Design a protein around this ligand. Sequence first.
Ligand SMILES: CCn1cc(NC(=O)c2ccc(F)cc2)cn1
Length: 165
Amino acid sequence: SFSGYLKLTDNVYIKNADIVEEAKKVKPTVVVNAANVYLKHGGGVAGALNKATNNAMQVESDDYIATNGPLKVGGSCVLSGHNLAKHCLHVVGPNVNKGEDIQLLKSAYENFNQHEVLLAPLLSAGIFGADPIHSLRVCVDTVRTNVYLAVFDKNLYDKLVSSFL
Ligand SMILES: CCn1cc(NC(=O)c2ccc(F)cc2)cn1
C-alpha cells in the first residue's frame, strides 16, 4: 500500500514524490490526473502520466473526447489507469493562467469523493497557476475519501507541510 506519507488529517496524506513513480510503485486503484477539458496531456502531471503510459493515455483520451466532447472545468471522467493504476480519474481544476474561476477548485476536488482511495496531485497547482497552499486547504476541506497527495517539488512539499494549519 502507500508508504512514507505524512498524515495531515483523518483522510488526507502527503508525500514528496513523483506521482508517476508513486503510481508505478503502488499501482493504486485510482490515480488522479491534473487534466484539462480537452484531455490534451501535454505537460505538468498530465504530460508526465501520459508519457509513462507510452501515449496510451492520450490515445484513449482522444477517443473519449471524440465521443463525448470536452469536460467541464471542475469536472472529471474515469478512464483506464494503463500501467499506472486500475483507473485514472482525469480531473479538471481551474487554470488561473487561462483566467478560470478559482472557486471551481472545490468542485474539482468533489470528484475525489466518488472514490474511496486515490493517489493524487494538488489540483490547479504547478502549471495551472493556483497557489498550492490554497489547493491543499481546499483539498482537506472538500475531500472526505482517503487521498494520498504526491508533491513533486521538495521545497514546495516542505512549505506545504510547515504552513499546514
Ligand atoms: C514548487 C514549484 N512551483 C510552485 C508553484 N506555485 C506557487 O508556488 C504559487 C504561489 C502563489 C501563487 F499565487 C501561484 C503559484 C508552481 N510550481
